[PDB]
């Protein structure tokens, strides 16, 4: 039937694991009619209502409909404790109030094993080589992977999405492309992995020649 | 009303001449009061007739599902020929059209990586096969050992790189004793940009 639609998005995994960042649960409604644009939000954390949400003004889409977004800042420890977050939306374009609920992935968390793999000797003929970081056996799939060397971050890398393995855990690979000289000259490269099952939600493994 | 989906042939079917690739046209949500459906297939605008149509299977939904399958020529799909499917269930027909991804093929580099020494403390180890610098993303990866096929592996999806090419990883899990006894493992990769559409890289202790 006709009327607006309500979506509720979880925080970025990286925002959850780092305390220097800010994890957010976002409730966004679309297809809000111009004839009835006024939208009210109501947030609940495990049934208890919170009021610290920040609602952005109605943005008019291309087709005269409106998009309204309400964003709620959550606590790192709260989200990881599995606390449920509810978003209730009230609008005249809807026959009734609609509630959506989101929470952390359920299931026993498993610590990721991190292994660094040196380049293949065959790839040593090309100008740049591939440093590989294998992260496996972790649960849930929310994870973050970065690269560092000499303190400064190396930003020339890509990371495959989490893949479900036979034992119900995930695995992925991260590939950092470096100039051969920097690898031949014996520099130390560190694969950084962040995950809720790790000690202090962080670990790193070095890789050199 | 009913809706139509069109699916490409499996990447492995298009590369190995032994297998036969097929495009599949699916029609769902067919009302019980109107199950009569006709299909029309077109190759680069030219209509073909060598397609086989499965019977109307009923769903729990009290609606029906009709599936049409067209056999395609291996070289046709590799050249970018367009396959269109027209469905009529009444002057209101729905068209769907699909072909191979546009662009110049780039052959993949295959590198076999041994398990990290830190993993030797576990009962099973990981054999890593890196496939990079290929286009398009259509690719297939398998594992063999002493001729016999290995099945305990998992392959990541193709990941788009910076130079407009793709890369992926494939990870085979074997018992540590298998690896320690110097058994030979090989990573096989089938891609259109490879000579004979096939290459293999060995890996052992």
Author numbering:
A (entry chain D): 235 to 443
B (entry chain C): 237 to 325, 328 to 443
Q: What text does the study give?
A:
IgG antibodies are responsible for antibody-dependent cell-mediated cytotoxicity, antibody-dependent cellular phagocytosis and complement activation, functions mediated through binding of the Fc region to Fcγ receptors and C1q, respectively.
We now report the crystal structure of enzymatically deglycosylated, serum-derived human IgG4-Fc (degly-Fc)*, solved at 2.7 Å resolution. The patch exposed by the absence of carbohydrate in the degly-Fc structure is partially covered by the intermolecular CH2-CH2 domain interface, burying a total surface area of ∼750 Å2. However, in degly-Fc, Phe296 faces towards the inner face of the CH2 domain in a manner that would not be possible in fucosylated IgG4-Fc due to steric clashes. In contrast, the CH2 FG loop in chains A, B and D of the degly-Fc structure adopts a conformation which is similar to that found in IgG1, and folds back on to the CH2 domain. The degly-Fc crystals belong to a hitherto unreported space group for IgG-Fc (P622), although the same space group was reported for intact IgG4 crystals, and the six-fold crystallographic axis generates a hexameric, planar assembly of IgG4-Fc molecules, in which chain A from one Fc molecule interacts with chain B from another.
